[model samples]
Target: MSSEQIEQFVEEIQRDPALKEQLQLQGSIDETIDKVIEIAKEKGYDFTATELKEYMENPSDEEEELSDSELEAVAGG
Candidate 1:
């Protein structure tokens, strides 16, 4: 999706009072997803253009590709 579409979705999500409260209280997923996106920005990665044909199509080969440090970040090692 384009940035404009994603921005509209985010605004719609934020407009729900209960959902907004929950997001404010537990925003880890939001932060984590954003963190991943930010890394993509720095690496010049585009999920829409690249990952769909690569990783998304070959799901079985995507196991344990990360280094120990990357695993530790997710597992709290």
Candidate 2:
């Protein structure tokens, strides 16, 4: 349930170029995560920075080549 929150954030950024770009143009991994958690918190997402780091490093599900449109359609449904 809480993990879904992580997935949604990941999907959200993947679907938004600006957000992805913002992450790409980051200061450091730690810095980015701090900002990520901050951004997520701004949007009412509550999760620790460590969880975000773990999720990104060890993504349990298949996310590689996850199509943006595919996610949009799934979300629409």
lDDT of 2: 0.60
lDDT of 1 by residue, 1-77 (tens): 56565445445544666544544444344343454344355645454522333222222335654555422223120
Best by TM-score: 2
For each candidate, give its TM-score against the true structure: 0.35, 0.57
Best by lDDT: 2
What RMSD does model 2 have?
9.8
Per-residue lDDT tens digits of candidate 2, residues 1-77?
36677788878867887776766666455655665676677777765644447755433547574555532121110
Predicted structure 1: clash tally: 0
Q: Report the alpha-carbon TM-score of model 1 versus the true structure.
A: 0.35
Once model 2 is optimally superposed onto the true structure by TM-score, how far is the C-alpha of residue 6 displaced, in angstroms? 1.2
